[PDB]
Design a protein around this nucleic acid. Structure first.
Lengths: 150, 150
DNA sequence: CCTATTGTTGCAATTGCAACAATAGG
DNA sequence: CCTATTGTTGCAATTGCAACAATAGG
């Protein structure tokens, strides 16, 4: 069985570090861009749903989202039928940053996917989607506190 | 073209968070285990070379390597020919941790590579190798300070 | 002498395990 | 009432852009 955890970890460290440095121009912090991007596509969704689809810690997302709302990029309004859910909507400062973030994310994507044909990227989109699903259960299994057996 | 950066970010966050909590029992910090894995297999390596292979910040490294030596997990040695380079070697408690660490990583890799035939993982190893190489230039590009033009 | 390497700290922010809250929804 | 959901703070870290120092190797 050949390792894959290493390269995927390397590739993510680079792409995230590039995005952090480039987005510091737009005053976005270390990991704050992954939230607003997802919040802009799915308007009004909840911390717990983002925590699930993004696979980050809940407390880490809580304070990181507190700044995006403090610094005026998103707004957390509540629903009349739910006293606990906080529906996270983007502001006009956030709606204008989304087309720019898509360009850095897409240009970094084109640099990373340089050399692949249209069929090769789909074979890689499917392979990564499968790996993302295979690891989803064990992430919450360890996140809850349960001990793995190996 | 389709997007690949998003899934790669999710997979690397989950695999890292799983490894962090499970290596917390072995008194390794938030991201310290990635260094010791490489130092054990590359004895006499320098901190700068690790920064290049792992694609993490140089300041993030140096501060983290300090704890690795401060907590007796590795050792910083000086050479005769070079008063600038610090050849990094693991301690004895560092060597005994290596077969355990590549046992959790090995199993996390098997969970991630679930349902792939032996050929499908090679088509994935070779694919991720290019993506790692394709992004190698642009990361040091931005890290050094030069602005990127789309 | 000169420039790229190799390596460290000053703030200042993020990160995340506990540990604790409070509603949802039976 | 009960339990899963959803959420925030306490606090001790790591993390990272500046701003530095110091030898390597011409």
């Amino acid at each position: 069985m050949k390792d894959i955890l290493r390269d995927i970890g390397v590739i993510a460290r680079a792409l995230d570090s590039i995005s952090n440095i480039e987005f510091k121009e737009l005053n976005l912090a270390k990991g704050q861009f992954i939230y607003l991007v997802r919040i802009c596509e799915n308007q009004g969704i909840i911390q717990e749903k983002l925590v699930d689809i993004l696979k980050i810690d809940r407390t880490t997302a809580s304070r990181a989202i507190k700044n995006l709302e403090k610094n005026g990029l998103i707004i957390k309004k509540q629903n009349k039928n739910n006293k606990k859910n906080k529906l996270l909507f983007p502001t006009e400062k956030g709606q204008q940053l989304y087309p720019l973030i898509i360009r850095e994310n897409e240009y970094s994507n084109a640099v990373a996917l340089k050399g692949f044909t249209e069929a090769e990227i789909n074979m890689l989109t499917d392979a990564l989607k499968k790996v993302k699903e295979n690891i989803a259960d064990d992430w919450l299994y360890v996140k809850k506190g349960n001990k793995r057996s190996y």
